[PDB]
Amino acid sequence: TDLASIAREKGIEFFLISFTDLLGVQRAKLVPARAIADMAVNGAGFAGFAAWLDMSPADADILAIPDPESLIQLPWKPSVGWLAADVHFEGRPFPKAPRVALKSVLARAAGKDMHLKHGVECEFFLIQPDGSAISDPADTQAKPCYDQDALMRRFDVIAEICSYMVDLGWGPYQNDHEDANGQFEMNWDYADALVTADRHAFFKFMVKSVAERHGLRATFMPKPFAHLTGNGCHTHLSMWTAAGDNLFEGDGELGLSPTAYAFLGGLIGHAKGLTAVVNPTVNSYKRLNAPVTVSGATWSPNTITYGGNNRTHMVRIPDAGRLELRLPDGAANPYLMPAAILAAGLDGIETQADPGQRLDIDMYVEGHSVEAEQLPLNLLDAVRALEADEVLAGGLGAAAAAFAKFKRAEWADYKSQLTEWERRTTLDC
Template identity: 35%
Template sequence: MKTFTKEDVLEKAAENNVKFIRLQFTNIFGTLKNIAITVEELERALEGQISFDSSVIEGTVDRHESDILLNPDPSTFVIFPWRPREGAVARLICDVLNPDGTPFAGCSRSVLKRNLAEAENKGLHLQVGAEIEFFLFQTDESGKPTVITHDQAGYCDLTPVDMGENARRDMVLTLQEMGFDVSSSHHEIAPGQHEIFLKDDDALAMADSITTFKFVVRTIAQRHGLHATFMPKPVSDVNGSGMHLQISLWRNDQNVFFDQTKPNGLSAIANRFIAGLVEHAGALTAVANPLVNSYKRISANDLAPVLAGWSENNRSAMIRVPSWRGAGTRVVLRSPDPSGNPYLVVSAALQAGLDGIERGLHPPAPLKEDIPAWEIKNVIREKGLPRSLEHALKAFKQDEVIWRALGESISSRFLRVKEQEWERFQSKVHRWEIDEYLRNY
């Protein structure tokens, strides 16, 4: 993570002829927001003197909003490469504060910082990498997105079959120019689907990166006449998009998930962390898969992470432990999708794992590598993740650890808004129902 000071930001803004600065922040539901200021206001902004009302953070407008302040993090200063060099545009990611300078309870970035500080007090440092999938679709004559893919390519195909290669290359180059450490990129299994892999970083920096990543990918796609979507399952009958988190815990520069004295190389801490994730799988799913549409992705098929368990190779498990050992030992949480708020997803996963460590939980036996198609539905009934947003929210409501990880303010607002979302979905008649029933009933 960069260590810019306020003075560094002012100096770099002047050196690079920055004219506008976007003060960016994320609302409870993971949507990136911003307030644009001119460079003349930058010094005042760096002192935390830009104010607005809390409705933009909480995602809804009601009669109980409060005044809040933006507190930019100087280490997040970056200039947008796609904007003109003359009159350049930069951004700063902000924490949200109360007028008295304390963290605003609805600020998900502050929530992650609190959870990471709790881990640090136990001598543990969280590192996270992210494999993020998305679709590229064509737009219509009015520029509105369609669900028509721009190619019919498959896993790791090349041009000319992979027609998104140029857009994806520009995305990677832009991300690298902005300081991202990109490990790889490729075409995914479904037509029009792509993946970019961000290398491990400090958990807070990675959550910042995921939020920025989605903004950059959509911006570059638009410049190619395409629409990038992180909707988990935009097209029926093909794979949905996931956001696999590669998690490792460190103490004094040592990966505490690794123990060379154990037959499989996994330490007691690693096993307990995995057990905590499985223990809290239901509530964690509500945070990591927060849309009605999310549950169209985590349904029974060969690749969807539908089971609350772990394995080295079974792709139906929510957790995979790759074969790498030593410093590369990690737990891959495969169930999240990219619609989730990364600050809250990482917070929930961390506290679930810490709970497993503190309580000395033992993980279930690893799932066998090959579960026949005829058996998978029976296994899902016993060990499956929630099958709908409604079921996930019920688990979330009852889980004190995950509720506490997000805090009372965010948890209660998240639950209320998501229950309303489920009820709106339930009240609508969908195309499938018309096609299935109208003719026969």
């Protein structure tokens, strides 16, 4: 792939050489086309301490080496070409970088002829530019899910993005108004994990950019409104052979194989530590274990459990040959999430983990009359669990410890904030 030739052919005047840091932030440099060949070979230089990579201002620059197969001409601005990149440091891929970490786990699975494919359901809200309320003041009803009126009221922005995804070859197939007022979701086809991760990273940027062009704002925040359903990132998962067979497809219950159940056994066994990574913010813990919403259900997990075609659990089995992890939220890192899921799932397979008993009940109601482990209740406990989880931490490489350091500091920063609630309830102590 000759980026310089493509630039001339396609009318690309600038490239964004982009990488995702440990907090999911999209870091990028805008390089004119005249300079792209040098960047493609040598990488684009960044001072790593200035991003969430856990480095030092005394370190040599990281070099972000773009993956030319990731190229996307911005559909709303085709003269700019976006590239995803691997962060290198001292002549090697830098293990603290999320994309590099995912590729490491992918390579170990590939080594055993197991290829992760996943799809993501990236819920988002459309809100006012100042972020104080949803973008549509006429979207107010108690059960607004799939509301035809409010959906069509945002047809222009939804249709524009959906059409871009058609053009990009992602195979979009549905657009919904989701369960909270102001909340939407646009699905597209699953793919090899690295393809989906790059798409996931690009998708969020695309949605935010387009919303902004329409005088709106998009947020993937886990719990932007106290009494409304939160933003999930439900992740659909299966493992394939290079020959093209889905290893999860089987003759067991619900059409799953023993490999599928073992992979699930790993998700279940490592759930506490996995929460730290797929629920990576303080705010994440207001979506999990949340009080019932105005629409009648939170639709998020409270417990470390799985069901059949049942949306009240940590894991749902929607159909034969795949698992839906409902645990992640909209803040989950597009690269770290698949990486930690894969690490856990692999350990499950390797150890033939038992996921325990499928629960065919509504956990929100018929959950108090059963023994089920509760998810970590806050970021601190989740991070504590990640640190104690040798498989996850080891699986993610140096990314895990750096991630844990940052999230601990975020939690501490959160603790120090004085809230109006404490004042009202404690001033008269």
